[PDB]
Amino acid sequence: ELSTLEAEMAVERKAVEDQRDGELEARAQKLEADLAELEAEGAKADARRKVRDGGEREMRQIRDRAQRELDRLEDIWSTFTKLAPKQLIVDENLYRE
């Protein structure tokens, strides 16, 4: 059943990836809209610095959340493929997965 299981896993990984890409695109467009709005209004060259640092921090956050989910997936799959008796599984979360 390895072929079917790996197919399902690959599709799930791609689902995480495409969702991350959508979220990050949305947040990048929102950052550009907010910068344009600050430009239309009183444009403080430091307030736009604040909002750009905030946008980039949020994008780091989305990317890193999606990345930790992808890595969790990776460890699930490599553990199942290399599974063997006497193997110790310490993470309750990974074991229930």
Swiss-Prot record:
Top-rank lineage group of the source organism: Bacteria
Q: What does the record say about induction?
A: 6-fold repressed by starvation.
Q: What does this protein do?
A: DNA-dependent RNA polymerase catalyzes the transcription of DNA into RNA using the four ribonucleoside triphosphates as substrates.
Q: Which family does it belong to?
A: Belongs to the RNA polymerase beta' chain family.
Oligomeric state and interaction partners are given as: The RNAP catalytic core consists of 2 alpha, 1 beta, 1 beta' and 1 omega subunit. When a sigma factor is associated with the core the holoenzyme is formed, which can initiate transcription.
Put simply, this protein is called: DNA-directed RNA polymerase subunit beta'
Organism classification: Bacteria, Bacillati, Actinomycetota, Actinomycetes, Mycobacteriales
Query: Which start and end residues of the full protein are shown?
Result: 147 to 243 of 1316
